[model samples]
Target: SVQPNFQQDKFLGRWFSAGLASNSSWLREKKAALSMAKSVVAPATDGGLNLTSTFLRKNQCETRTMLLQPAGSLGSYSYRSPHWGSTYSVSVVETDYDQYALLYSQGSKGPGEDFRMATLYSRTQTPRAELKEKFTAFCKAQGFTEDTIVFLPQTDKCM
Candidate 1:
């Protein structure tokens, strides 16, 4: 939500999550069961970003696709639900473009039920200490505390 300019080419590729923080009750219940998730970042025909995410759930592999439609800016995007009338604002808050990317998103899924999430993505499954520190600080700054943030475990099921 802070980065002004966004670089699409630098961020397009394969990435796996090193950490994640969220405020949704749904996430709170399943945080412990969640594992490292892989995603393929591609450009959409509408000048937005297409995220094809793969993860493990209940010892099974699951995949989902989300489109980040371009807003007024090149880097800013709005993610609208297909069935529901909800919109999430997503941004590449920080990134090295090679080592790690810290993404931030926020929205309301229901009446007065606000949701916020941050994901630390690494080029590899492992994350550097510096990147981890930055990711933690960034999430905290966005209102997520220690208990809500977690470093995901490695999983071979999705790979």
Candidate 2:
């Protein structure tokens, strides 16, 4: 399920990662060293969104920019990736504008692409206790188990 009465203008802003739930082996292998991710959401020229994200990966600051087009709806988006020919479907599972947003994504047809990811996006670097629980609950509700869920460690930003 996604947020009702999705407000695009209200959603545009900087978001910080607080929790994660993913089926990526690579992420599981490196979860201990993972830090919060940062994402900047801005409106695109053609009514899409430009998401610029930065995070610590492979001992370096990695950044990626993705273009999310409306998937014939306001709360869902389609992202055709340049990495590994993957096409991803992103959704805003829930949010309350000024506090937090739950983002879920799934990808299709590519090497090492059989993965699902959920991110808890917050307005501040530090997430509230309730929001952490909210993220975990949402992940579990979506069928992810304990092994796939993790609360990101608080670390200095990469950039």
Candidate 3:
């Protein structure tokens, strides 16, 4: 499910990854020493969204770009990663357009290779406490406990 009155144009922008929740083995393998994350949403020529996700781990930055196409519903999208050979279903469950957003994604290669991730994005390095609460509630609604969510530290500067 997604938010009502969702608009893609208003959703395109830079978002700082403030928090995340997941039970993915992929994440567990890569989370150690992970530092920062940022995502840039831009317009694609095919009337979809171009998402560039940048992640800093052990001081090294890695970027992955994915093209998201509408998934027959508002605020729902499907994305394929050629590099990873995986397909993802993304849902924008909560957002305020200018402040914070909560995104949920489930990716799978097959029946045995499946993973899910939740990301909390903020406009700035730090988000309001109320927004954080909202993110927590959203996670719980998605069956994630408090221990499952990890709050990313804010960096003084991003390289």
Candidate 4:
């Protein structure tokens, strides 16, 4: 995956989820497709990030907090999820500083097994059509089939 040159300050904020592509059964079973979500990123120690992901699931709003530590590479970070017993390697696939961001991530059990996902985020309630098209192209480049790329719901009801 390609990692963009990420500017931490420019990347910090509440980014609404615009689209998602994943093969994770957990996400599918949870009906993540129907969820409205946002990610709040804050600077942490050692050039890391404190990420808070808020989403609506089962008619209730929920939050998941994680500490993202630098993974010895620019635009690369790692965070563990106890719910899945996995550590995710997250990289900035693409971003426009002010409007949108595309994240490439992989979850691993060990040296050989992994699950992949890509998340598209925007700073607006509705992303520009061109941005969505660009995100779809990026997803395809990452081997995500068209059917696997799901456009997420956007609503203030979850806020």
Candidate 5:
């Protein structure tokens, strides 16, 4: 499991989705879907972190929450999706411990480049240059060509 970085509290705040690129069925749930909403925070006094999600993929909104405790270099926890009434035991893949970017997977290895479901999130509307570099590098490491990313533009930008 990977331990989340709590040193940057701003990264813990609510992040409105700036963009997303996914072919996952979950993202295609609504007519104008939310896709995914991520919240980062230090909820536990013991330095454990909480990462929650609101997946409005279907006709109804589905909310999932995960509380991660430091497990060596990983953040390990049980995750639950409330509206869907589903749950799982998950961990953040920590190739880079400090970078907020993570590979959320059920286990170590997945087929056909499982990083396809990976998400890039931040507390700010725009990620800084350094972070973008880190994010891009991380994707490259996973064999995902950055040029092929079809980021879903924010609705406001369409105006």
Candidate 6:
């Protein structure tokens, strides 16, 4: 679970994932698949959120999303992952937020049935390395032990 200091109000716009951090080997291996994924964050009721992604492996055309609602007393969240035409219920722990400080994970107990999924989002692809470092520190504080995060390099011609 990622920490939840997100203002929620300020994060209501389109953000492209510029990079990702995780301690999972599968994610490290499937980093390429992330390339095919584009994350979208939309607003929800009472300072909550709706998240969707067009994952390359699960694309039914446009996008797939997790319907996340605030659950429990301490801001523990419940999310529904809808993909390939099916939905699975899960819980999330959201952590800190700032202008480029995007990080989170699935499963709250620990990193077993847990996955470390980090989304380094930016209004543009090329954010400052300093910004990445700040985010890196944020992730480290949030228990990303290995700090195995990577920046998605943008094509020069595309830039």
C-alpha lDDT score of every prediction, in listed order: 0.81, 0.83, 0.79, 0.79, 0.46, 0.55
Candidate 3 lDDT over 1-35, as tens digits, reads 78788898999999888888888646644664566
Candidate 2 clash pair list: none
Question: Candidate order by TM-score, highest to lowest?
Answer: 1, 4, 2, 3, 6, 5
Candidate 5 lDDT for residue 129: 72
The TM-score leader among the candidates is 1
Assess candidate 1 and give its lDDT.
Answer: 0.81
Q: Compared with the true structure, what per-residue lDDT tens digits does model 5 show for residues 1-159? A: 343552334345565443333334454233234544444455655565676655444434565556654444435544444543544444444323233444443322323233244455555546667756655665566555655333333322211
TM-score of each: 0.89, 0.87, 0.86, 0.87, 0.49, 0.62
lDDT of 1 by residue, 1-159 (tens): 546576888889999877889987577557558665688999899988899988788778888899998876666788887555678888887877889888888774543237788989899888879889999999888889888988887687766
- lDDT by residue for model 6 (25-106), tens: 6666676554434556787775466877554433323455666676553334555433323222233333233446454545
- Of candidates 6 and 2, the better by TM-score: 2
The alpha-carbon RMSD values of the candidates against the true structure, listed in the order shown, are 2.0, 2.2, 2.2, 2.2, 6.4, 5.5
lDDT for residue 90 in candidate 2, whole number 0-100? 88
Candidate 4, residues 1-159: lDDT per residue as tens digits? 445566778889888888888876666445554567677999988688998877786777888788888885677888777767678888887888788889888865543137888888898868999989988999898898877888887557656
lDDT of predicted model 4: 0.79
In model 3, the clashing pairs are none
Error of 6 at 98 (Å): 7.9
Of the candidates numbered 3 and 4, which has the greater lDDT value? 3
Which ranges in model 5 have alpha carbons more than 4 Å from their true place?
1-11, 16-33, 36-38, 45-47, 58-62, 74-117, 128-133, 146-159
Name the lDDT value of residue 71 in candidate 2.
80
What lDDT, from 0 to 1, does candidate 3 have? 0.79
